[PDB]
Symmetry: none
Subunit: 262 residues, 4 copies
């Protein structure tokens, strides 16, 4: 009747242990469409020089996102795309920069709410997938005495549960650049709940596949029921790393989100 097509600025946010590198296929695909794309390493992730033992909360871990959003020009707005654990990075950012966020896109991601503790969807994830196979765990004591659990993701878990259907080159890449990570779950438990005015007001799009072998269909569906997304897009096939196994589909879905939220 009147049709609309929009170009947007997407800020792509990796999950813990990973870095900006997992977006290396989706970032050129989005740029083919003319969108602007920023892919950031969070503290102690990718090639960020900080070590995880110097980081004391998931909020401190999120510093690169918040700094980048503090830096945005007046009137610029971004669509934050976060995979796996990064729905927590979107919730943290949205409670500081709601103004700057056109929409949050959850990509096989944790979907925080405002009603329960920030750690709530993490506890639910762990009830759903409690065995992290060959993952190793470590701890350190943070700046106020909390003991923080970190992990080095196991290679079998990487091969079968996160990168199930990815290329051998993509799986070898992962092994070559994967870092330690932490959920800081116990400090999240002590955290103020996400606000309604910030995070609670953001548009929220949930992309997911039922073939995800680590954020399982029962968990994903529980999250959607628990906090209704403004839109849900289920991708057929692929695996947890849909930005690698369904790069073009994900880019076409993200075009639709730009058209709807700019």
């Amino acid at each position: 009747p009147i049709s609309k097509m929009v170009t947007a600025h997407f800020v792509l946010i990796h999950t813990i242990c990973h870095g900006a590198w997992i977006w290396h296929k989706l970032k050129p695909a989005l740029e083919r469409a003319g969108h602007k794309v920023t892919a950031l390493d969070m503290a102690a992730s990718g090639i960020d020089p900080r070590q995880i033992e110097q980081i004391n909360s998931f909020d401190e871990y999120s510093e690169p996102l918040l700094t980048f959003l503090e830096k945005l020009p007046q009137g610029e707005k971004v669509i934050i795309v976060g995979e796996s654990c990064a729905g927590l990075n979107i919730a943290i950012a949205a409670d500081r920069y709601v103004d700057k966020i056109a929409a949050g896109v959850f990509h096989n991601s944790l979907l925080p709410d405002t009603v329960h503790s920030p750690s709530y969807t993490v506890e639910k994830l762990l009830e759903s997938f409690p065995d992290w196979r060959d993952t190793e765990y470590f701890t350190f004591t943070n700046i106020t005495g909390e003991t923080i659990t970190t992990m080095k993701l196991g290679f079998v878990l990487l091969r079968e549960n996160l990168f199930t259907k990815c290329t051998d080159g993509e799986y070898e890449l992962a092994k070559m650049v994967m870092r330690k990570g932490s959920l800081f779950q116990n400090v999240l438990a002590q955290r103020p709940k996400f606000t309604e005015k910030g995070y609670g007001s953001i548009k929220k799009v949930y992309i997911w596949t039922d073939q995800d072998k680590i954020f399982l269909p029962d968990f994903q569906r529980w999250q959607i029921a628990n906090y209704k997304p403004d839109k849900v897009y289920q991708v057929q096939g692929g695996d947890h790393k849909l930005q690698l196994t369904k790069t073009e589909e994900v880019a076409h879905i993200l075009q639709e989100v730009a058209d709807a939220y700019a």
Copy 2:
């Protein structure tokens, strides 16, 4: 067909990740593959300012080799500047090395100082375009120049023919690096008994836009390798643009030097 253990060594500023396509290809043929990050490269936690020479930068290779079980031998494959890591390593562990393979790489010799081919390379390719440079003073007082490779140079000279996903990955994980050229200029020449006795295979393409044809031809003539394999096409990153080809040459090296 012999299966071999290959130790793949990236160049300065890069990391084990550039071998992400070559490591599975080699493993499809039954080979064992170890891809190492050098100091302050890839995801190694050290920053470049705490490394004081190119031998300290080679530490992950030397520690690996130091620990190789007695009687095992490896084929070290090095790209670009990593021919200098092969020579450092061959001088210390000649008996653990079945052959050195140079992939569009510096090919040091025994007759001139360790920085000779770096001088030659820079003479050949003097403008590193948008690359930025920085300096720090190392622990004995020398000024070390570091660089942050420029994205136009990355796109047109290094990753000329690489996929967009590959070029984009490169920008996502590239680190600062240093040739430590002036410390190489003061370094003892590579020995004849160590580096000089190693079998040497040189892989290149005349389509490389940064180690140019006449510089690579100069190198071959300056220190003739046991075997030279020339790949047609590709770009400087043959392990990305000609992956199966390099894997096939590396199979011939395994067959020949077991």
Copy 3:
């Protein structure tokens, strides 16, 4: 008499060595003593330019405490700037600490930022005479100022009344150091539950020529300790000039906080 385990913490630029007279004295009374080098201090192999904050500098203390066997408690004694290491450490391990002792030391509080007493000290003693200063940028972009303490300052202000052998040792092993003051200015204040709950004993002398009487009196009034012991005479390095006296006070602290 209770015997206690004392963890002695030197100040920036120094190392475990300043406690070389105090550690045997304490051990003559049956106490266990651990004297640690902080990052890039004494003979620690790290250089100051790779340390990025005062909490990273405190790493040898925190690792020690992290490993203390369950149920053991220590008395941490800190000189000069090391009151900041006690506060960092008390925030992370309050239950492992029987008491903090401040030996002519900064006494941080919970109400103002972590750099408050450093600002105050510098206001009090602004000219560090022949000290030289240097800067580097840490891994997140902050400019960190380092110093090399000047030998006249070492002789007249720090080691005022020390033996010539002691002053000479000091020159032989002194290292660069940093307050990381601007990073302390950005740091979360010390907590009431951790540092704020620790027992605190302040040892000083009014003959100290660098932490001057009115600055030390200001500190006591700003954050009143559980006990203040004033030693007559000596100089800033009471563990060298009043060794048996400090050992005797430290015995009273062991008796009191077991």
Copy 4:
């Protein structure tokens, strides 16, 4: 008849594992007499920032001495005092800077000769004292493939054999600043012999005590017989670290060496 008194520039050289710090009592004592004193840390010793694994020979280890002697003004000459292993540092230096050396003083030290391999007195030391008690050993591979043995001196050996009669403060100091060390003995074995024109021409004074519990009377006496010192001064009592247990005696002996050799 005519009496002479001379002020000299002494360069004090520590043994492996130790640093310039062991001279902290003798350096003020010599300066009381008006002499000029330089005490240098050798590579990877004291607070020198290099690590022993980056050092490849006893000659490279000696760099701080040779650099300092390269730096001396025309016509200045020094008396090099070396304790324990540092007679090897004096021999290396004398083959580069004979011109700059008024005398070499061996202080319970190895006394190299020109007739045998540079490693010869080390082999003889080890036959004499083969058990280094609680010392730990390690190896690394040097720049041309030689395996180098390093050691961390044991605390009992330190207490009873090197610092036998020293103060508890002096013994605690030692433990607080002691570093790894190496003799590089196998690379010394491969080294050209010290020359007659350089080291062979230097004046040589041997200070020693028969109470030394690590360079034992039979070893010391064998060395004196093997290569006659221009003068020998035996100190009664003390221990291996005569610059700590006999600081003033050693300083008066060193005055006599200044008077005789300037």
